Write a protein that binds this ligand. Structure first.
Ligand SMILES: Nc1ncnc2c1ncn2[C@@H]1O[C@H](COP(=O)(O)O)[C@@H](O)[C@H]1O
Length: 241
């Protein structure tokens, strides 16, 4: 996924890592096979693991939510490793925020709507679609020249992400994930984007409940703004087995 995000000043802080067993970490997002593959190539290439996982302790369980690190986690498991260096966050601090991403596309709206309807969704023209999506009352608003409601909740949201990645792979559309919906509207005015998909961002509380149910979001659903990026670390791959 091509990304476009606000140039956020986030400070690097020197926080120590701790090794946490991979089987104590819970994903909140579906994996992206290419990102998994790129991590595997990179870590096996250097033999240094330099970027700690960011975790949050799951209330009432001997388990951690993966805040950042899904492909590191999954890649290390696929290689046979058993742990990863991790930074434990104060996740429910006001200092940690969660937003979402806004998938936007240049291409044919009609092929996209057909394919959405092919996976059991509907796409209803609706001038209040964006207001409804922002309140969490529908799955996605689809907004460009016309405004459309896509009814539902999580299952319908995952079909939308799934259809778009299929059509991206097929090269029937160009797909950019925007950090901010207004940057997708700043660029749409310029003529670079036709349409943007708008959902209500998940809350921290919802993220944690989802993993407690053993469920996951589509890729590019959560967008965490953290109080810091951990400084880089000096851990050998051989230490993780
Ligand atoms: N040798 C490495 N050690 C640790 N992380 C890496 C290495 N090479 C690439 N990465 C990161 O692995 C991450 C894989 O995606 P994710 O774990 O979902 O954040 C990317 O953010 C890369 O920066």
């Amino acid at each position: 996924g091509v990304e476009k995000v606000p140039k956020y000043d986030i400070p690097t802080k020197k926080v120590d890592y701790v090794f946490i067993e991979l089987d104590k970490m819970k994903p909140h997002a579906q994996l992206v096979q290419k990102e998994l593959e790129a991590f595997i190539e990179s870590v096996t290439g250097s033999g240094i693991f330099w970027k700690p996982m960011l975790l949050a302790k799951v209330p009432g369980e001997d388990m951690y939510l993966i805040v950042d690190g899904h492909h590191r986690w999954a890649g290390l498991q696929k290689l046979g490793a058993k742990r990863a260096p991790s930074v434990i966050l104060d996740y429910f601090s006001d200092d940690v925020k969660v937003y979402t991403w806004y998938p936007a596309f240049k291409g044919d709206l009609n092929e996209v709507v057909e394919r959405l309807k092919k996976e059991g969704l509907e796409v209803i023209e609706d001038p209040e679609a964006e207001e409804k999506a922002e309140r969490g009352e529908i799955a996605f608003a689809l907004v460009g020249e016309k405004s459309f409601a896509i009814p539902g909740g999580l299952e319908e949201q995952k079909k939308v992400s799934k259809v778009l990645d299929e059509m991206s792979v097929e090269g029937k559309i160009e797909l950019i994930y925007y950090g901010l919906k207004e940057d997708a509207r700043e660029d749409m005015a310029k003529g670079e984007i036709d349409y943007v998909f708008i959902r209500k961002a998940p809350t921290k509380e919802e993220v944690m409940e989802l993993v407690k149910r053993g469920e996951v979001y589509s890729p590019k659903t959560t967008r965490h703004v953290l109080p810091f990026n951990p400084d880089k670390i000096d851990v050998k791959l051989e230490e993780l087995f």
